[PDB]
Amino acid sequence: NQNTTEPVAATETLAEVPEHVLRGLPEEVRLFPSAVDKTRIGVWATKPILKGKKFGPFVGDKKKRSQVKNNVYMWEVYYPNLGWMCIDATDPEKGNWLRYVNWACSGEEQNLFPLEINRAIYYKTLKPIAPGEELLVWYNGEDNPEI
């Protein structure tokens, strides 16, 4: 979280992405080091993307909250008669290219928001995205005007 002189303990490069994850991207996006955290891989637009474009589904292993160790590579989704489950893509072999979409910092420059369809998370564009801009997800906000 810092451009400083302290040593970095772990780096993720393009060489470490699973081959089947790379083969799965649509034309509009590519994988490339994140500008938000250059020690990890992120997702970038290759061409103009319209507002309202949907990507997904996000996939991952179903686990109880008590078994998941981070809030970065996971979403929570309810399954009737099974309960609230975490969909965990911490291990990239269990997920797809949506795993690599980094999070906006306090929503800054967010251009993707989550929506649930058929008990899976998809990402939808909040605004148009220009070629060479990083895809960044954050939560839904309360958008209504108090005027």
SS3 81: coil
**Cα distance between residue 44 and residue 101, in whole Å:** 9
The answer to whether 42 and 102 are in contact (CB under 8 A) is: yes
**Cα distance between residue 63 and residue 83, in whole Å:** 10
Nearest to 34 by CA among 51, 12, 67, 17: 12
The answer to whether 101 and 107 are in contact (CB under 8 A) is: no
- Which technique was used to obtain these atomic coordinates? X-ray
**Which domains does the chain possess?**
13-138 (2.170.270.10)
State the amino acid at position 82 in one-letter form. Answer: L
Tokens (6 digits) for 36:
């938000």
**Which residue has tokens 């891989």?**
41
**Cα distance between residue 29 and residue 85, in whole Å:** 29
**Cα distance between residue 40 and residue 87, in whole Å:** 20
Q: Please give the resolution of this entry in Å, rounded to 1 decimal.
A: 1.8
**Cα distance between residue 52 and residue 124, in whole Å:** 6
